Amino acid sequence: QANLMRLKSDLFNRSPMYPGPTKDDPLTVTLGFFLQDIVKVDSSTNEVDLVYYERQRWKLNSLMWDPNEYGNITDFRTSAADIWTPDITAASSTRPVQVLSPQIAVVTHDGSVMFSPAQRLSFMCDPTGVDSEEGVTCAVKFGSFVYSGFEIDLKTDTDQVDLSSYYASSKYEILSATQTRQVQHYSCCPEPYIDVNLVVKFRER
Amino acid sequence: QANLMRLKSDLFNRSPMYPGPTKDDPLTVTLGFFLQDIVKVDSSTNEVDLVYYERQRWKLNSLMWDPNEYGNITDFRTSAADIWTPDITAASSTRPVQVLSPQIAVVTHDGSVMFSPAQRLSFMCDPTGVDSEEGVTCAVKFGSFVYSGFEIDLKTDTDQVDLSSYYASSKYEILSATQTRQVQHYSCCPEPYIDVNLVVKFRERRAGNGF
Amino acid sequence: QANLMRLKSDLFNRSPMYPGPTKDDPLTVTLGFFLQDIVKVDSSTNEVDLVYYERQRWKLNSLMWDPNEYGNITDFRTSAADIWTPDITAASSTRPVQVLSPQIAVVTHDGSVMFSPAQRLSFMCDPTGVDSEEGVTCAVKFGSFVYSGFEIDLKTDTDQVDLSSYYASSKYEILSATQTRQVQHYSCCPEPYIDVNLVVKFRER
Amino acid sequence: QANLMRLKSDLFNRSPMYPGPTKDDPLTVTLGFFLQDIVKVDSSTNEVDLVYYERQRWKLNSLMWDPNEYGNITDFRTSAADIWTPDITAASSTRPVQVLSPQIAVVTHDGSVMFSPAQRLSFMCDPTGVDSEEGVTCAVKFGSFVYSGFEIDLKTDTDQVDLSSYYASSKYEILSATQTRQVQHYSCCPEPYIDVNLVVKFRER
Amino acid sequence: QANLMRLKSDLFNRSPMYPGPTKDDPLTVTLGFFLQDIVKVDSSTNEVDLVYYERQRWKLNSLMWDPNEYGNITDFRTSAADIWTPDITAASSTRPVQVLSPQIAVVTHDGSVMFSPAQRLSFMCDPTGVDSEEGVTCAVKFGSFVYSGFEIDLKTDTDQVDLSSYYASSKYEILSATQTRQVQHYSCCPEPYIDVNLVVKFRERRAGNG
Ligand SMILES: O=C1C[C@@H]2OCC=C3CN4CC[C@]56c7ccccc7N1[C@H]5[C@H]2[C@H]3C[C@H]46
Ligand SMILES: O=C1C[C@@H]2OCC=C3CN4CC[C@]56c7ccccc7N1[C@H]5[C@H]2[C@H]3C[C@H]46
Ligand SMILES: O=C1C[C@@H]2OCC=C3CN4CC[C@]56c7ccccc7N1[C@H]5[C@H]2[C@H]3C[C@H]46
Ligand SMILES: O=C1C[C@@H]2OCC=C3CN4CC[C@]56c7ccccc7N1[C@H]5[C@H]2[C@H]3C[C@H]46
Ligand SMILES: O=C1C[C@@H]2OCC=C3CN4CC[C@]56c7ccccc7N1[C@H]5[C@H]2[C@H]3C[C@H]46
Ligand SMILES: *[C@@H]1O[C@H](CO)[C@@H](O)[C@H](O)[C@H]1NC(C)=O
Ligand SMILES: *[C@@H]1O[C@H](CO)[C@@H](O)[C@H](O)[C@H]1NC(C)=O
């Protein structure tokens, strides 16, 4: 109790918040999707609803501490509002994302943060052919809203999306689910943007 | 008035908030479900909506006081925002939980906290067979979102879910309702996670069973 | 202006907020319902939607003042967030209550508070028979969420619910509407809880 | 920039917020409705949805300044949260009002405030006959929620509702739209309440 | 880290917030629409739902800094709540705008701000004829809610709306999309108001142009 209280107070109250990465001090965020359910499909609007956990990881020097100075504490939990979090956003949503979990991150003594919120997302997807054997493929890109590749880079720890919690009696079964880093240029903006492309092939069960 | 004001000021203003449990100082939270209503079932999405009270209990040394130092006060009520609460979450929801009550906890002189909010949850459930006599079974796990078994443990005071306030004219009648501690390992994470599994067998309301 | 500003500053800024009632210093809240409209009925879910004003009254010593010390001011209006309010809750709602009005209370020199928000409530009710001549009866209990009878007691000023603002072209007409204090014990909890039971008999017009 | 910053700091930071009108220092609020669209009608619930601007005006001595002391500034814009606003509310709503605009007021050197938010309101209205040539009439009262006629009075600058922005391809055309001050006594309350009654006659196109 | 922290503290904590433009010190905001999807059309209410990015740009002297005084930093990102933003609003919405993105702006050393939120808007539009080959045209004006032309002026960098991110399998295909500055007088108000008029011609997705 006493040690952890002091640690948190030293980090968050006594110094200013991390102001985000820069070209001089860029940052790599690791992303992993754990798909839980394709809830529904709206063929009149081409919107599809997913439930998933999005695991995000990154490391800041300003969150480091020596465990021996603070009661042998190696890690702690804290409200995501107490720390900088990356502005990772789906690029083809049609509604604001619904958060289905507390927003709490895990900070380790080496400055590592793991943050893994559950979300329901409605996104752009034509479900024509979902009732077939072939199924249908849809995709959604996730990346930083304001940070280019020179400030935020993304990687995945694997190309395969974790389907081990996928709801077995979902109305839709997953044929394939991948997550793949991409570099992209858009007419809006001079500098390149990095995303992870979630590609899901699925059909009616 | 005067004594309780001082007690609250001593606890909440004069010291920092409890920063949650750790591997060295873990915590056991007790859970009890009081099921009120199965409001609806959506067979086109396999989502079902429950209304229930979730009673949570735990005990902190940092919330202890001697009643004789504070006007013989044994317990008080306070906004849940004034204290640490455990991050107990349903593991198969499809919408954000709707809170149907004030969020106020009861703190006792021994450091016990009881906190019992009402909620409406939509969760993953195939209702195929609900219109039968047999009914249908669905389940939802409740556990800490970020704390493993080494920091937060769960127990129940009984396997039986309290159905004594269940809405008698619900469209769905409850056949059985249990709540059972489980230990689980997931591919995401090295350390084990504890949940309480709410298992509810229910069917569309009938006038008469079988002969 | 000048007097009222001082009064409010003396009460709310210069002393702590009232921490709620206790067994030693319990409190009585008076409830009165003014039913405006039964908007709809959902027979597929047994939910019914009411619009109503819930008048709440109570009296605190910590809100008293002498009018002669403050420009002859006998009462004032203020945001409900500036004061303690009782945690009166419907016991069989199925959605969070929608507030249809500002949340402003009236405080009188004797420490009386009147607080009278407009609300839309969805609650548990089987409407089977609403299309009949007999109609249908439904009920909903209102009481403190955390305070037992030893801390908060409830009374009504009358058994009859005020229907004088009821929408004349509602789809549902009210046959009867009562509000009745009750004492209750529940298996969860050792001490007794007080509620006011709103009982409404109504039918299609 | 420099002058306006000082003016705002003099008014809002250096003195307390206006605590609302009283019997000794009452206030007149002027109301004007600018009707934009009748979006829809629900005949199964007798609810109708309007989009409109509600222009509110009032004058406080505590917001006066001499332009010559502050760079010749005659008026400025500011967030409505920085000032007291009146609690004018529709008396027969069935959902919370949706705000469709920024909430920003205009303050003039004489202490005048103009505040003119856009809103979507669902309110109690039987649309039976809207498909006829005669059309249908509906009405909704707007008034202070907590201030009686002794504290807040209302007036209009005209009996005619401004239809000059009304959506020309609305599903419903407006036949007539008036706004009329009323004095009212209710069974709840001893003192009189003032409202402006918005009366709209409309039909299908 | 250290330099940027100081820069932000110098600008936002040590001086007061910009109180908005005036007749003496007016401001020009540049607008650019990037249309993503026409999600749906409701012919029973004449409401249509768009998803789009609205790029807003303006320049304040009070946000200038010399890069050489602050570790060679030419620009930074920050929460839109930390700065003044213009009150640009759709003039014929029927619901509150849904924000589909973080609200973060980019500030440059010359005092330039770029702010580009994603939004879903429901607005007044009669879709009669959307199922035809000709399609249907709808329009919505965007302008300052409280600032007249004497305080806020608007311009576009181009008349053409960017459709390069438009969802290719939308239920509705875009035939044309323009954005055009206008000056307007209204019966409410003596002084003129500036808007940019977003005009979109669209139809139900076909599979052939006939
Ligand atoms: O037009 C676009 C689409 C594109 O979407 C992928 C993600 C991106 C990251 N941010 C989010 C806003 C955006 C941008 C800025 C200014 C105008 C339009 C615009 N967007 C996105 C764009 C990239 C780059 C940038
Ligand atoms: O994929 C999962 C499923 C599983 O759900 C039961 C509850 C858990 C408690 N927390 C909440 C998020 C979660 C987690 C972290 C990182 C990636 C995926 C992931 N989840 C849940 C998981 C456990 C562990 C952990
Ligand atoms: O199980 C219940 C039902 C009952 O509902 C009527 C109102 C009450 C006032 N508060 C609200 C929460 C409640 C309570 C506490 C702990 C477990 C279950 C539980 N509830 C309600 C109960 C009473 C008492 C208490
Ligand atoms: O019962 C009512 C209906 C009536 O509605 C018109 C507007 C009014 C202004 N305020 C809003 C709340 C109200 C009031 C106070 C206490 C109990 C009931 C009650 N209301 C409204 C009433 C008036 C007076 C008062
Ligand atoms: O009544 C109106 C309609 C008109 O709508 C187009 C947009 C405008 C920009 N602002 C937003 C509010 C408004 C205004 C001010 C005071 C009373 C009514 C009123 N409005 C809009 C008006 C213009 C001008 C002004
Ligand atoms: C840390 O652990 C050591 C043994 O490794 C133990 O003796 C000590 O109590 C702990 N130190 C602190 C400061 O808690
Ligand atoms: C960065 O560094 C040099 C000096 O080392 C400076 O003169 C230059 O203008 C800076 N910025 C850019 C964009 O090169």
D195: its two tokens: 């409202």
Q: Do B163 and B174 meet the contact criterion of CB atoms below 8 Å apart?
A: yes
**Could you give the 3-state DSSP secondary structure of residue A2?**
helix
**Could you give the 3-state DSSP secondary structure of residue A75?**
strand
Which chains border C (3 or more CB–CB pairs < 8 Å)?
A: B, D
Cβ contact A100–B93 (<8 Å)? yes
Question: Using CA atoms, how far apart are residues B51 and B34, in angstroms rounded to an integer?
Answer: 9
Which pairs from E155-160 meet CB under 8 Å and 24+ separation? Answer: E155/E28, E155/E29, E155/E30, E155/E31, E155/E181, E156/E30, E156/E31, E156/E32, E156/E180, E156/E181, E156/E196, E157/E30, E157/E32, E158/E32
Of A9, A102, A171, nearest to B16 by CB-CB distance is A9
Question: Using CA atoms, how far apart are residues D102 and D117, in angstroms rounded to an integer?
Answer: 7
C152: closest CA among C197, C105, C196, C193? C193
The HSE-up count of residue B4 (CA atoms within 13 Å, CB side) is 19
Phi, psi (5° rounding) for residue C69?
Answer: -80, -10
Q: What are the start-end ranges of the H helices in chain A?
A: 2-8
DSSP class of residue B177 equals E
E32: closest CA among E158, E139, E152? E158
For the purposes of burial, counting CB atoms within 10 Å of the CB of B54, is it exposed (0-12), middle (13-18) or buried (19 or more)?
buried
Q: In this structure, which amino acid lies at residue A39? A: V
Question: Using CA atoms, how far apart are residues A104 and A83, in angstroms rounded to an integer?
Answer: 10
Distance of CA A178 to the CA centre of its chain: 14
**Could you give the 3-state DSSP secondary structure of residue D128?**
coil
Which chains border A (3 or more CB–CB pairs < 8 Å)?
A: B, E
Q: How far is B184 from chain C (nearest CA, A)?
A: 29
Question: Using CA atoms, how far apart are residues D26 and D155, in angstroms rounded to an integer?
Answer: 14
DSSP annotation string for B186-206: ETTEEEEEEEEEEEEEEEE--
Question: Using CA atoms, how far apart are residues B196 and B33, in angstroms rounded to an integer?
Answer: 10
Cβ contact E146–D102 (<8 Å)? yes
DSSP class of residue D107 equals E
Q: In this structure, which amino acid lies at residue C181? A: R
Ligand nearest the Cα atom of residue C162: 4
D31: closest CA among D107, D117, D101? D117
Question: Using CA atoms, how far apart are residues C179 and C199, in angstroms rounded to an integer?
Answer: 6
In chain A, DSSP assigns E strands to 27-42, 47-64, 75-79, 88-90, 98-99, 104-108, 110-115, 118-124, 136-144, 152-155, 172-186, 189-204
E179: closest CA among E53, E48, E63? E53
Which residues in chain E are contacts of D106 at CB distance < 8 A? Answer: 146
Unique residue bearing structure tokens 């039986």: B160
Cα–Cα distance list, E121 to A26, D59, E89 (Å): 35, 35, 11
Dihedral sign, Cα of residue A184, residue A186, residue A189, residue A195:
negative
C143: its two tokens: 């009481």
B148 is in an annotated binding site: yes
Phi, psi (5° rounding) for residue E114?
Answer: -115, 135
CA angle B38, B40, B46 (to 5 degrees): 110
Which residues in chain E are contacts of D165 at CB distance < 8 A? Answer: 186
Dihedral sign, Cα of residue B41, residue B46, residue B51, residue B52:
positive
The residue among B46, B88, B195 with the most chain A CBs within 10 A of its CB, best to mutate, is B46
Q: Which residues of E28-42 are buried (b: 16+ CB within 10 A; e: fewer)?
A: ebbbbbbbbbbbbbe
Rounded-to-10 torsion of CA E139, E144, E147, E151: -90
Which helix H or strand E contains B96, and what residues bound it? none
D94: closest CA among D53, D137, D45? D45
- Residue positions counted in chain E: 210
Q: Which chain A residue is nearest to residue E78, measuring alpha carbons?
A: A19
Which residues in chain E are contacts of A62 at CB distance < 8 A? Answer: 1
Phi, psi (5° rounding) for residue C2?
Answer: -60, -45
Q: Do E111 and E61 meet the contact criterion of CB atoms below 8 Å apart?
A: yes
C168: closest CA among C24, C59, C37, C40? C37
E144: closest CA among E198, E183, E97, E87? E87
* SS3 track for E24-75: CCCEEEEEEEEEEEEEEEECCCCEEEEEEEEEEEEEEEEEECCHHHCCCCCE
**Could you give the 3-state DSSP secondary structure of residue A35?**
strand
Question: Using CA atoms, how far apart are residues E123 and E38, in angstroms rounded to an integer?
Answer: 11
- Residue positions counted in chain B: 211
Question: Using CA atoms, how far apart are residues C5 and C24, in angstroms rounded to an integer?
Answer: 33
Question: Using CA atoms, how far apart are residues D33 and E196, in angstroms rounded to an integer?
Answer: 25
B38: closest CA among B53, B25, B50, B29? B50
Ligand nearest the Cα atom of residue A184: 1
E176: its two tokens: 């044309």
B51: closest CA among B62, B66, B60, B38? B38
Q: For chain D, give percent helix, strand, coil, nearest 5.
A: 10, 55, 40
Q: CB-based contacts of B80: which residues, under 8 Å, 6+ apart?
A: B103, B104, B105, B115, B117
C107: closest CA among C74, C138, C140? C74
Q: Which residues of C138-165 are buried (b: 16+ CB within 10 A; e: fewer)?
A: bbbbbbbbbbbbebbbbebeeeebbbeb
DSSP class of residue D97 equals P
DSSP annotation string for B102-116: --EEEEETEEEEEE-
Question: Using CA atoms, how far apart are residues B62 and B15, in angstroms rounded to an integer?
Answer: 9
Cβ contact E171–A145 (<8 Å)? no
Domain count within chain B: 1
DSSP annotation string for D153-181: EEEES-SB-B-TT--TT-SEEEEEEEEEE
Q: In this structure, which amino acid lies at residue C178? A: T
B105: its two tokens: 């906890």
Q: Is A20 on the interface with E (CB under 8 A)?
A: yes
E100: its two tokens: 């589909």
The CATH number of whichever domain residue C39 belongs to comes to: 2.70.170.10
Phi, psi (5° rounding) for residue C145?
Answer: -70, -45
Distance of CA A67 to the CA centre of its chain: 28
